[PDB]
Design a protein around this ligand. Structure first.
Ligand code: IRG
Ligand code: NAR
Length: 339
């Protein structure tokens, strides 16, 4: 049943992987990642060894979540699972988890930080992000942590959304309703991140380089304008309401003055993505229909996900229960077909 494993000390940490995976070679660091050759498919792959996956209730739930998410993602613009394995023979000695995914050249950070991109490159890159977001959103998953280092791009300019990238602060791409600590935000927090990402591709500069959460807000409202009465009446917290309307009434900027000389269609999408009011923000699906993607948009080739059960998220279990649920998911893994 079980293939032949082999051991080695790879820098900081030890690895025991099946003989199928050769030429392990460190690439960085939640857990650490190696590059490898997969003799079975001929692919270069990344093997990820989780750091102490079952050391607390938090880790154990996180390990389980991650594994369920990856097993479920089957889509061109979303990282998926090639293989998952443990060197453990039984539940009793189950203590280490390894995940295998496609290896990609660089992240989006690595392309913008060194250059600009032309308008046709942003189109295709953002198009692919919105296409993967459409699929993730359709399973009632929200990403929450979209930023350049979470977008992997190969030398063909093909893009995949990663669940956790390699270690530019997270807050620079966070929606204002999450800065303010709103408990009830929706899927379009992710649209907000995309708007920030696109903006950064188009101009080469972080749109909102806040030093902290207050600075961040200050920088956001300075482009988008302080909230009107229609938004203000939907804010449940007295203090947030006070902070907001305690501030100087900044007017909304014309985006065409901030993004001078960019495609006027790109400026239009951005207007629709960077709305302070979350209820009005364009969705991923709608954004795919926007004129700016005219040369790529195909409604018969932008699929949605199967139903994803996340009832587990509300459960409070013992470390050994999460551990055993995670073992079941390893055991039942069906490899995706070659081709
Ligand atoms: N329908 C909505 C739309 C936007 C909202 C928003 N956005 C903040 C301007 C960024 N913030 C909040 C909120 C409520 C209580 C505490 C902290 C934040 N609610 C919103 C409800
Ligand atoms: O190729 C990958 C896969 C990714 C990853 C591997 C395993 C996993 O479970 C989640 C993500 O690590 C990366 C990190 C990067 O900066 C750039 C990359 O191209 C990659």
């Amino acid at each position: 049943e079980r293939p032949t494993f082999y051991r080695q000390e790879l820098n900081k940490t030890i690895w025991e992987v099946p003989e199928r995976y050769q030429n392990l070679s460190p690439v960085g660091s939640y857990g650490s990642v190696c590059a490898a050759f997969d003799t079975k498919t001929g692919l270069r792959v990344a093997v990820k060894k989780l750091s102490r996956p079952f050391q607390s209730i938090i880790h154990a739930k996180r390990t389980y979540r991650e594994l369920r998410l990856l097993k479920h993602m089957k889509h061109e613009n979303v990282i998926g699972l090639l293989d998952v394995f443990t060197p453990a023979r039984s539940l009793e000695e189950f203590n280490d988890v390894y995940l295998v995914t496609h290896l990609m050249g660089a992240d989006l950070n690595n392309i913008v930080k060194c250059q600009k991109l032309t308008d046709d490159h942003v189109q295709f890159l953002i198009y692919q992000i919105l296409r993967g977001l459409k699929y993730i959103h359709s399973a009632d998953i929200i990403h929450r942590d979209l930023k350049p280092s979470n977008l992997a791009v190969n030398e063909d300019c093909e893009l995949k959304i990663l669940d956790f990238g390699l270690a530019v602060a997270t807050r620079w791409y966070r929606a204002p309703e999450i800065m303010l600590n709103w408990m009830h935000y929706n899927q379009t927090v992710d649209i907000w991140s995309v708007g920030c990402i696109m903006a950064e591709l188009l101009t080469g500069r972080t749109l909102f380089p806040g030093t902290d959460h207050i600075d961040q807000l200050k920088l956001i409202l300075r482009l988008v304008g302080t909230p009107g009465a229609e938004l203000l009446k939907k804010i449940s917290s007295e203090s947030a309401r006070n902070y907001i309307q305690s501030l100087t009434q900044m007017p909304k900027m014309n985006f065409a003055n901030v993004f001078i000389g960019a495609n006027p269609l790109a400026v239009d999408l951005l207007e629709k993505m960077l709305v302070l009011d979350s209820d009005k923000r364009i969705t991923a699906a709608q954004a795919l229909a926007h004129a700016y993607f005219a040369q790529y948009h195909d409604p018969d080739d932008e699929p949605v996900a199967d139903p994803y059960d996340q009832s587990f998220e509300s459960r409070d279990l013992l470390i050994d229960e999460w551990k055993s649920l995670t073992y079941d998911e390893v055991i039942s893994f069906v490899p995706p077909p070659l081709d």
